[PDB]
Structure formats: C-alpha cells, structure tokens
Amino acid sequence: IGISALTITPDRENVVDFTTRYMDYSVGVLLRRAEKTVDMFACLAPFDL
Amino acid sequence: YSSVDTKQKGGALDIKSFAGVFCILAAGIVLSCFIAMLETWWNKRKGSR
C-alpha cells in the first residue's frame, strides 16, 4: 500500500491503481499580512529619478 | 489583445510627459537671446551707451 500526499495523475495511473479520491487538490498562496507602511522615501516619488 | 501599452506603473512624471514645460524656458532663452542681439546691433548706431 502507498499512502501520502500522492496526487492522482494519468502517468502514475499507468503503473499503479488508485482508489476514489477523498480530498480535493488545489493551488494556493501564502502571504504576510499587509504592511501598508509608506515607503521610507515616498516623499521622492512625485518625479522620476 | 493590447488595449494600451501602459508601461508606467509609479505614475511619476518623466521627461517626455513633462516635455511641454521645458518649451516655455526654451522660448524664453531664444527670445532673450534675440533681444540681446537687437541691443548689440543697435549699439552700433546709438552713438552713446
């Protein structure tokens, strides 16, 4: 028996048999909470360098 | 699919978008040079300075 975070894929399914999926896969993002702190030099933004 | 080539992101003014303002100083330079030319010419005919 194999048991892990093993995603079902067609290629693996040519060499192993999979049971019914019990948990749905998804792609997502980890972020830090928004540090909306103004840029240290925001006062120079009005004109290009 | 291009609606417009945005290019800018910071919204800072750049030499192109500010270009019209320099034309006022250029015109002032040109006109003051021409006034200096006219005085330098008339200084050949005033007889006194």
UniProtKB/Swiss-Prot annotation, chain B:
It is found in: Postsynaptic cell membrane. It comes from the Eukaryota. The chain crosses the membrane at residues 18-38. Tetramer; dimer of dimers. Interacts with EML2, MAGI2 (via PDZ domains) and AP4M1. Interacts with BECN1, GOPC, GRID2IP, SHANK1 and SHANK2. Interacts with CBLN2, but not with CBLN4. Interacts with CBLN1 (via C1q domain); the interaction is CBLN1-NRX1 complex formation-dependent; CBLN1-binding is calcium-independent; CBLN1 hexamers anchor GRID2 N-terminal domain dimers to monomeric NRXN1 isoform beta; promotes synaptogenesis and mediates the D-Serine-dependent long term depression signals and AMPA receptor endocytosis. The PDZ-binding motif mediates interaction with GOPC. Member of the ionotropic glutamate receptor family, which plays a crucial role in synaptic organization and signal transduction in the central nervous system. Although it shares structural features with ionotropic glutamate receptors, does not bind glutamate as a primary ligand. Promotes synaptogenesis and mediates the D-Serine-dependent long term depression signals and AMPA receptor endocytosis of cerebellar parallel fiber-Purkinje cell (PF-PC) synapses through the NRX1B-CBLN1-GRID2 triad complex. It is linked to Spinocerebellar ataxia, autosomal recessive, 18: A form of spinocerebellar ataxia, a clinically and genetically heterogeneous group of cerebellar disorders. Patients show progressive incoordination of gait and often poor coordination of hands, speech and eye movements, due to degeneration of the cerebellum with variable involvement of the brainstem and spinal cord. SCAR18 features include progressive cerebellar atrophy, delayed psychomotor development, severely impaired gait, ocular movement abnormalities, and intellectual disability. Belongs to the glutamate-gated ion channel (TC 1.A.10.1) family. GRID2 subfamily. This is Glutamate receptor ionotropic, delta-2. It comes from Homo sapiens (Human). The lineage of its organism: Eukaryota, Metazoa, Chordata, Craniata, Vertebrata.
